Amino acid sequence: KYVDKIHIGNYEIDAWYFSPFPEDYGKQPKLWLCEYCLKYMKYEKSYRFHLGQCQWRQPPGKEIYRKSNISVHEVDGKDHKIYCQNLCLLAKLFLDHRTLYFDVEPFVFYILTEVDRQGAHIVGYFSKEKESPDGNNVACILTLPPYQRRGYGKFLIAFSYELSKLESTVGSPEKPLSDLGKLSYRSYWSWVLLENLRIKDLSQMTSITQNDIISTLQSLNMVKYHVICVTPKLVEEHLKSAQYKKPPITVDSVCLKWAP
Ligand SMILES: CC(C)(COP(=O)(O)OP(=O)(O)OC[C@H]1O[C@@H](n2cnc3c(N)ncnc32)[C@H](O)[C@@H]1OP(=O)(O)O)[C@@H](O)C(=O)NCCC(=O)NCCS
Numbered sequence: 418k419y420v421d422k423i424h425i426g427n428y429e430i431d432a433w434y435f436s437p438f439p440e441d442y443g444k445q446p447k448l449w450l451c452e453y454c455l456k457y458m459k460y461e462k463s464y465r466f467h468l469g470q471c472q473w474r475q476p477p478g479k480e481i482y483r484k485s486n487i488s489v490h491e492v493d494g495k496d497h498k499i500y501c502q503n504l505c506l507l508a509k510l511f512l513d514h515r516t517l518y519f520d521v522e523p524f525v526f527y528i529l530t531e532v533d534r535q536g537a538h539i540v541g542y543f544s545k546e547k548e549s550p551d552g553n554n555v556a557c558i559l560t561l562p563p564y565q566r567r568g569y570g571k572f573l574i575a576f577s578y579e580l581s582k583l584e585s586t587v588g589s590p591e592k593p594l595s596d597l598g599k600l601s602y603r604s605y606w607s608w609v610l611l612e613n614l615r616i617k618d619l620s621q622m623t624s625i626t627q628n629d630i631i632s633t634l635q636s637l638n639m640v641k642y643h644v645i646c647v648t649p650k651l652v653e654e655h656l657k658s659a660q661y662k663k664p665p666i667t668v669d670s671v672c673l674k675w676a677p
């Protein structure tokens with residue numbers, strides 16, 4: 418039996434994919450995860466014992482962003498191996514990506530949490546390969562199912578580009594993108610590009626690669642072969658529309674503490 422249901426915090430969540438937890442963990446009806454240190458446990462009794470004893474109330478690593486009730490922690494795989502391995506096992510339940518089976522040490526993990534008086538509760542994350550030879554600025558991105566459809570995905574995508582900008586570099590998500598990844602990236606890219614029009618220049622200003630700018634402007638019919646072709650009025654009409662709305666949660670540069 419594979420792991421098919423997890424309990425984490427106040428949520429139970431069904432699996433979407435196989436994840437390589439040790440076999441005896443799959444055998445039980447539920448896998449129980451500490452929401453703060455991501456330890457995985459086999460029994461409600463071991464879970465309850467852990468909850469009473471664990472001192473963690475947020476992710477490890479460095480808190481690098483806080484705005485309203487959300488915060489981001491930067492977690493280097495080399496520095497917090499066990500945590501990042503636990504994270505990857507969790508994530509693999511909802512992602513089919515090869516990096517989830519690989520060493521965590523070559524990666525950095527950006528953990529998104531909602532903060533309240535009880536703690537900083539994980540809602541999603543993205544991973545990033547240090548010094549990616551393919552210029553990938555995200556490897557994996559995930560919003561845990563109970564938190565989906567609230568704008569956290571597009572926040573994580575935006576955050577990944579805010580780092581690329583500060584690194585003075587373009588980047589793209591590791592391909593192939595899942596269908597849900599495609600929808601999310603296209604939405605973000607569309608908004609950013611239209612605000613900027615209200616290609617190498619756009620690429621330099623946004624850290625979005627020219628290829629991803631070209632494919633996005635193609636969908637907006639704002640490019641000829643590549644040359645951008647749109648009026649200010651056309652751009653304003655799109656930004657007025659319900660199809661190219663601003664992300665509900667955006668990254669504020671004056672709430673970030675980060676250098677390359
Ligand atoms: C991709 C993912 C991170 C999006 O997270 P999220 O928090 O739901 O994203 P958002 O709330 O910011 O939504 C982004 C866009 O995706 C659309 N979307 C998200 N889930 C959708 C769904 N199930 N059906 C249709 N549209 C969906 C949203 O409506 C939104 O469109 P809009 O910007 O035009 O309004 C999330 O679906 C996920 O974690 N999936 C599993 C892992 C995965 O596939 N990751 C990406 C792999 S490359």
Ligand SMILES: [Zn+2]
Nearest residue numbers: 451454456471
């Ligand atoms: Zn714990």
